[PDB]
Design an enzyme around this catalytic site. Sequence first.
Site, PDB file in Angstrom:
ATOM      1  N   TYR B 147       0.822  -1.207   0.000  1.00  0.00           N
ATOM      2  CA  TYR B 147       0.000   0.000   0.000  1.00  0.00           C
ATOM      3  C   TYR B 147       0.858   1.259   0.000  1.00  0.00           C
ATOM      4  O   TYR B 147       0.634   2.178  -0.791  1.00  0.00           O
ATOM      5  CB  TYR B 147      -0.912   0.004   1.215  1.00  0.00           C
ATOM      6  N   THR B 175      -2.631  13.991   7.836  1.00  0.00           N
ATOM      7  CA  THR B 175      -2.350  13.112   8.962  1.00  0.00           C
ATOM      8  C   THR B 175      -3.625  12.291   9.234  1.00  0.00           C
ATOM      9  O   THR B 175      -4.309  11.912   8.292  1.00  0.00           O
ATOM     10  CB  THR B 175      -1.851  13.908  10.177  1.00  0.00           C
ATOM     11  N   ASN B 176      -3.942  11.987  10.488  1.00  0.00           N
ATOM     12  CA  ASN B 176      -5.074  11.102  10.775  1.00  0.00           C
ATOM     13  C   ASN B 176      -6.397  11.838  10.674  1.00  0.00           C
ATOM     14  O   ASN B 176      -6.667  12.748  11.457  1.00  0.00           O
ATOM     15  CB  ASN B 176      -4.937  10.475  12.159  1.00  0.00           C
ATOM     16  N   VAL B 177      -7.221  11.428   9.717  1.00  0.00           N
ATOM     17  CA  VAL B 177      -8.467  12.129   9.433  1.00  0.00           C
ATOM     18  C   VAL B 177      -9.620  11.473  10.178  1.00  0.00           C
ATOM     19  O   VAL B 177      -9.658  10.253  10.329  1.00  0.00           O
ATOM     20  CB  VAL B 177      -8.777  12.151   7.918  1.00  0.00           C
ATOM     21  N   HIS B 190     -10.138   3.045  11.655  1.00  0.00           N
ATOM     22  CA  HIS B 190      -9.103   3.789  12.377  1.00  0.00           C
ATOM     23  C   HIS B 190      -9.475   3.910  13.858  1.00  0.00           C
ATOM     24  O   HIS B 190     -10.620   3.645  14.244  1.00  0.00           O
ATOM     25  CB  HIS B 190      -8.918   5.190  11.779  1.00  0.00           C
ATOM     26  N   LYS B 198     -16.956   2.240  19.863  1.00  0.00           N
ATOM     27  CA  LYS B 198     -16.754   1.527  21.129  1.00  0.00           C
ATOM     28  C   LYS B 198     -17.475   2.158  22.308  1.00  0.00           C
ATOM     29  O   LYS B 198     -18.084   1.450  23.106  1.00  0.00           O
ATOM     30  CB  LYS B 198     -15.277   1.449  21.452  1.00  0.00           C
TER      31      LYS B 198
HETATM   32  N1  NAP Z   1      -8.791   8.682   6.436  1.00  0.00           N
HETATM   33  C1  NAP Z   1      -7.499   8.900   6.700  1.00  0.00           C
HETATM   34  O1  NAP Z   1      -7.068   8.841   7.829  1.00  0.00           O
HETATM   35  C2  NAP Z   1      -6.523   9.227   5.618  1.00  0.00           C
HETATM   36  C3  NAP Z   1      -5.248   9.675   5.946  1.00  0.00           C
HETATM   37  C4  NAP Z   1      -4.359   9.969   4.915  1.00  0.00           C
HETATM   38  C5  NAP Z   1      -4.770   9.805   3.595  1.00  0.00           C
HETATM   39  N2  NAP Z   1      -6.005   9.368   3.311  1.00  0.00           N
HETATM   40  C6  NAP Z   1      -6.410   9.196   1.919  1.00  0.00           C
HETATM   41  O2  NAP Z   1      -7.673   9.793   1.637  1.00  0.00           O
HETATM   42  C7  NAP Z   1      -8.257   9.132   0.507  1.00  0.00           C
HETATM   43  C8  NAP Z   1      -9.701   8.791   0.842  1.00  0.00           C
HETATM   44  O3  NAP Z   1      -9.730   8.268   2.173  1.00  0.00           O
HETATM   45  P1  NAP Z   1     -11.102   8.042   2.983  1.00  0.00           P
HETATM   46  O4  NAP Z   1     -10.668   7.903   4.426  1.00  0.00           O
HETATM   47  O5  NAP Z   1     -12.107   9.101   2.542  1.00  0.00           O
HETATM   48  O6  NAP Z   1     -11.514   6.597   2.409  1.00  0.00           O
HETATM   49  P2  NAP Z   1     -13.014   5.999   2.365  1.00  0.00           P
HETATM   50  O7  NAP Z   1     -13.942   6.855   3.193  1.00  0.00           O
HETATM   51  O8  NAP Z   1     -12.858   4.505   2.557  1.00  0.00           O
HETATM   52  O9  NAP Z   1     -13.462   6.204   0.841  1.00  0.00           O
HETATM   53  C9  NAP Z   1     -12.711   5.622  -0.213  1.00  0.00           C
HETATM   54  C10 NAP Z   1     -13.342   6.108  -1.498  1.00  0.00           C
HETATM   55  O10 NAP Z   1     -12.647   5.479  -2.579  1.00  0.00           O
HETATM   56  C11 NAP Z   1     -13.592   4.895  -3.466  1.00  0.00           C
HETATM   57  N3  NAP Z   1     -13.094   3.657  -4.096  1.00  0.00           N
HETATM   58  C12 NAP Z   1     -12.487   2.610  -3.502  1.00  0.00           C
HETATM   59  N4  NAP Z   1     -12.173   1.656  -4.422  1.00  0.00           N
HETATM   60  C13 NAP Z   1     -12.598   2.095  -5.621  1.00  0.00           C
HETATM   61  C14 NAP Z   1     -12.613   1.606  -7.011  1.00  0.00           C
HETATM   62  N5  NAP Z   1     -12.092   0.414  -7.343  1.00  0.00           N
HETATM   63  N6  NAP Z   1     -13.138   2.400  -7.961  1.00  0.00           N
HETATM   64  C15 NAP Z   1     -13.661   3.600  -7.672  1.00  0.00           C
HETATM   65  N7  NAP Z   1     -13.693   4.097  -6.437  1.00  0.00           N
HETATM   66  C16 NAP Z   1     -13.193   3.412  -5.396  1.00  0.00           C
HETATM   67  C17 NAP Z   1     -14.786   4.590  -2.591  1.00  0.00           C
HETATM   68  O11 NAP Z   1     -15.980   4.484  -3.349  1.00  0.00           O
HETATM   69  P3  NAP Z   1     -17.011   3.317  -2.979  1.00  0.00           P
HETATM   70  O12 NAP Z   1     -17.328   3.622  -1.534  1.00  0.00           O
HETATM   71  O13 NAP Z   1     -18.093   3.537  -4.008  1.00  0.00           O
HETATM   72  O14 NAP Z   1     -16.186   2.075  -3.182  1.00  0.00           O
HETATM   73  C18 NAP Z   1     -14.816   5.732  -1.604  1.00  0.00           C
HETATM   74  O15 NAP Z   1     -15.621   6.816  -2.085  1.00  0.00           O
HETATM   75  C19 NAP Z   1      -7.408   7.892   0.267  1.00  0.00           C
HETATM   76  O16 NAP Z   1      -6.500   8.099  -0.818  1.00  0.00           O
HETATM   77  C20 NAP Z   1      -6.625   7.740   1.552  1.00  0.00           C
HETATM   78  O17 NAP Z   1      -5.396   7.045   1.376  1.00  0.00           O
HETATM   79  C21 NAP Z   1      -6.878   9.083   4.280  1.00  0.00           C
END
Ligand code: NAP
EC number: 1.1.1.271
Lengths: 324, 324
Positions: B147, B175-177, B190, B198
Amino acid sequence: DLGTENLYFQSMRILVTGGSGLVGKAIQKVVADGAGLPGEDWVFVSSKDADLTDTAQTRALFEKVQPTHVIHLAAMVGGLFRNIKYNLDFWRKNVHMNDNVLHSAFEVGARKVVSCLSTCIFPDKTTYPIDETMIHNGPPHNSNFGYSYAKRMIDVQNRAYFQQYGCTFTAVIPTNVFGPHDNFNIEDGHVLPGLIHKVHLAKSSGSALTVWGTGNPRRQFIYSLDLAQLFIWVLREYNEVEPIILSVGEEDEVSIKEAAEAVVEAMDFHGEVTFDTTKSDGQFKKTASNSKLRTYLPDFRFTPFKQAVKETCAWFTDNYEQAR
Amino acid sequence: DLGTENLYFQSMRILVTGGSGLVGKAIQKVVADGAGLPGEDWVFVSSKDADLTDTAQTRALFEKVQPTHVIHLAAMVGGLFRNIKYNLDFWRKNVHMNDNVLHSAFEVGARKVVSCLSTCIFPDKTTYPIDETMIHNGPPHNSNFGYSYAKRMIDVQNRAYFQQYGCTFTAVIPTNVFGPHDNFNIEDGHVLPGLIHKVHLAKSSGSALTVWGTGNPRRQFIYSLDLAQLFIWVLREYNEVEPIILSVGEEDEVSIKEAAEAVVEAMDFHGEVTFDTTKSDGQFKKTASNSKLRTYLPDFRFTPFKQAVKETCAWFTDNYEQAR
Ligand SMILES: NC(=O)c1ccc[n+]([C@@H]2O[C@H](COP(=O)([O-])OP(=O)(O)OC[C@H]3O[C@@H](n4cnc5c(N)ncnc54)[C@H](OP(=O)(O)O)[C@@H]3O)[C@@H](O)[C@H]2O)c1
Ligand SMILES: NC(=O)c1ccc[n+]([C@@H]2O[C@H](COP(=O)([O-])OP(=O)(O)OC[C@H]3O[C@@H](n4cnc5c(N)ncnc54)[C@H](OP(=O)(O)O)[C@@H]3O)[C@@H](O)[C@H]2O)c1
């Protein structure tokens, strides 16, 4: 030792991508001269057989051949070292090629894949000598980062396939390779085959030899035929996922000047040899440790440098018209 | 300042992949509340609109939408942190997704792409705090290398597109969202949304809260709504290829213990809070510098932590049935 004391043999189908190149042609010769064992079918391909940047064509080749083993040499490599850089093209085409090959191998259920990495994958700022552990310890040289990172990701794929799926995909890291069927183009080719062509032109023209740069950079050279032997051994005997450097020792590094001297002697050249400092020197060193190779094959004797150069010079002269 | 003193406006079509997630939904709200400017069409998609691991589907989405700008949030992310690891799947699906998106954006002639990286890309062995220069200074943590390396390669693609083709592709590093529409699954999610769930179960069950580990690890948290604001700004105003960390400062790091206390208070929980030291602690710190962000936006005020937690807790309670 490329024979075996075993009395029975397994049916092996060995696909060699990039089989028409410098490294690939060396493997063909070594095999054709009797390094091949019973049960082994060696299948050497080139881009004519399939463009490996294309998933569909790669999949079809693998479906037809059904390899049990793969030596993966193919890379989009020319024209690296030219004036203008194309880092996206090199990154993207090579990643596609490597993914197509490793994943088709996975799909057909190949037992083992051995890919070819390069010293350009090593970090720019590093201690010396460099070993197989240090591959990811900092960014590669910016000149050709696209190509370098694409190669590095082969290691990452190998490690991932191993961890999740149990595949034995690994890689070798040659230093600077030279020999028959090299690319001897002076603008685009490597220094050693480039020098051989330059000296050939100096005799045919009656001119002097102009070497690019100071002649100070040091390099570890490896004869394609020596490499081929080690490659077949790795395929048969080496089972670490971590790659293995295939190279002469740190003590057998030679300068560009020393290399040009080996060519001048071998081609019996009596003209002047000048060093054009206007053209830029590359990296001073990229020194690699072969410690690991020595733990596996302590008694392996490399072809002496001057002999390997003579044979290569002899081949180039004898095949000038058909050569690259 | 998500407005403008400009009197004229350019027609912009902004595609947001991963628009249905935590980060994406925050951008929708911020835009819907009037951060959108005249001439901007915001198009938020999810996997229903196109599976971005599929080249053909991605190409078709981009042909239909014709984006001028792209915020790329989509990643294959679940179930990361589960017991058994799947490093090949995560490496390969994410690289495909990122290549499909960046290269379709390139093909349609998008002016700008902003991708989302993660602190998991940073080297395992590093000094602190970490800044945007140190991204490639050594390998990432082995737990989820697939990843991590896939994300790192977004930076390499951005740099290559810029160098060869002149594209302005860049990235942000949150950072951590945490916030509304997070994944609150306790086994897979997370820590912060996990804690919220919890505590909710502790009230509904009348049980005590069991926090995994010592509560000593320190983390920089960022509210999804704050991040959304910074994301829109980056899209409009930030033009470096090098990424930019979006985070509260080193001085606003908080421990897992302090985080649990913020939840306990916010959800008005009066049961016992125990710290199960039998389960292993993760990394102690992953501290990031926001120095760069501060040079661009010195006066930007983050939502206070306890308030952001309360709002998130409030959202979870009010939408428990519809939540993840
Ligand atoms: N949350 C954090 O702590 C954090 C920290 C640093 C960076 N990030 C980055 O922020 C970005 C989004 O994070 P998040 O926390 O918002 O994740 P999330 O809530 O799990 O949402 C992931 C999104 O990606 C889409 N997705 C996944 N697989 C797909 C596919 N094969 N084709 C099209 N769409 C797809 C999902 O759509 P479906 O739901 O329709 O599958 C969903 O809208 C990521 O790049 C993540 O690495 C997050
Ligand atoms: N020579 C060195 O100094 C050196 C050092 C370290 C590592 N290596 C590695 O050794 C490997 C081969 O190098 P070489 O020295 O033998 O180079 P080479 O003589 O130029 O051969 C390259 C081979 O790759 C094949 N190829 C290129 N693009 C292809 C595509 N799209 N589809 C299918 N095949 C394709 C070529 O087939 P066609 O000829 O039909 O195009 C050719 O057989 C590379 O992986 C390189 O990274 C070389």
